[PDB]
From Swiss-Prot, chain A:
Illness the protein is tied to: Intellectual developmental disorder with polymicrogyria and seizures: An autosomal dominant neurologic disorder characterized by a broad phenotypic spectrum. Main clinical features are developmental delay of varying severity, intellectual disability, seizures, and polymicrogyria. Additional variable features are non-specific pyramidal or cerebellar signs, and visual impairment.
Quaternary assembly: Component of the chaperonin-containing T-complex (TRiC), a hexadecamer composed of two identical back-to-back stacked rings enclosing a protein folding chamber. Each ring is made up of eight different subunits: TCP1/CCT1, CCT2, CCT3, CCT4, CCT5, CCT6A/CCT6, CCT7, CCT8. Interacts with PACRG. Interacts with GBA1. Interacts with DLEC1.
Chain positions with N6-acetyllysine modification: K93
Gene of this entry: TCP1
Species of origin: Homo sapiens (Human)
Binding site for ADP: G11, E104
Residue positions, PTM Phosphoserine: S90
Shown chain mapped onto the complete sequence: 402 to 533 of 556
Function: Component of the chaperonin-containing T-complex (TRiC), a molecular chaperone complex that assists the folding of actin, tubulin and other proteins upon ATP hydrolysis. The TRiC complex mediates the folding of WRAP53/TCAB1, thereby regulating telomere maintenance. As part of the TRiC complex may play a role in the assembly of BBSome, a complex involved in ciliogenesis regulating transports vesicles to the cilia.
Protein localization: Cytoplasm, Cytosol; Cytoplasm, Cytoskeleton, Microtubule organizing center, Centrosome
Transmembrane parts of this sequence: none
Assigned protein family: Belongs to the TCP-1 chaperonin family.
Protein name: T-complex protein 1 subunit alpha
Curated annotation (Swiss-Prot), chain B:
Family per similarity comment: Belongs to the TCP-1 chaperonin family.
Binding of ATP, residues: R19, G30
UniProt organism field: Homo sapiens (Human)
Complex formation: Component of the chaperonin-containing T-complex (TRiC), a hexadecamer composed of two identical back-to-back stacked rings enclosing a protein folding chamber. Each ring is made up of eight different subunits: TCP1/CCT1, CCT2, CCT3, CCT4, CCT5, CCT6A/CCT6, CCT7, CCT8. Interacts with PACRG. Interacts with DLEC1.
Protein name (record): T-complex protein 1 subunit eta
Parent-protein start and end of this portion: 380 to 452 of 543
Disease linkage: De novo genetic variants in nearly every subunit of the TRiC complex, including CCT7, have been found in individuals with a broad spectrum of brain malformations, and clinical phenotypes ranging from mild to severe epilepsy, developmental delay, intellectual disability, ataxia, and other features of cerebral malfunction.
Amino acid sequence: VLESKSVVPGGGAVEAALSIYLENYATSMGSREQLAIAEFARSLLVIPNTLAVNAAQDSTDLVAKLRAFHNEAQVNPERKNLKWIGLDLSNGKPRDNKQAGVFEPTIVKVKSLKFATEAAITILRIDDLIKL
Amino acid sequence: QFMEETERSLHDAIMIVRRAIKNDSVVAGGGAIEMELSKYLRDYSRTIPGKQQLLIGAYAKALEIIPRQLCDN
């Protein structure tokens, strides 16, 4: 909070929006890469899941319900009905900000985003491993 | 061996020409509508779920496979 007053509302409310936000960004891309966005949005969805899983919660009935919080896609307490906001851990469900509402420092995710995207593709790089 | 499917093309036309007659309302062929219907559900894949987007994501996609079968085959 103190070294970064820049932080995103929600840590987990992003995922549902993001997929949709990507699903939106997907559909216009067309070709294969409409889907290359979609499967990129499918990588997103574990974030509520392992949470709900480690919390012994049902992941779908949250992240789906999450994806049903919207008019357009944003994380914000003003519209939790018409937009996403926040998250919970033990129940797992979205909160607002001062509710339980989760945040993220905007620094960390983009880096985590950046890394997995890049490690996977170099993992996606090679087809061989040879030895003698 | 090439002579037969013309007649099958003739009747198949005759069928859906008569079927364009036996149904006044005739929409776009080649799986044109299903794609929108998928997104129409991808709407609900966003809009509907407490859960069932899992369905609405699954269900709708299967539409697009039939004209996909064409580009495929």
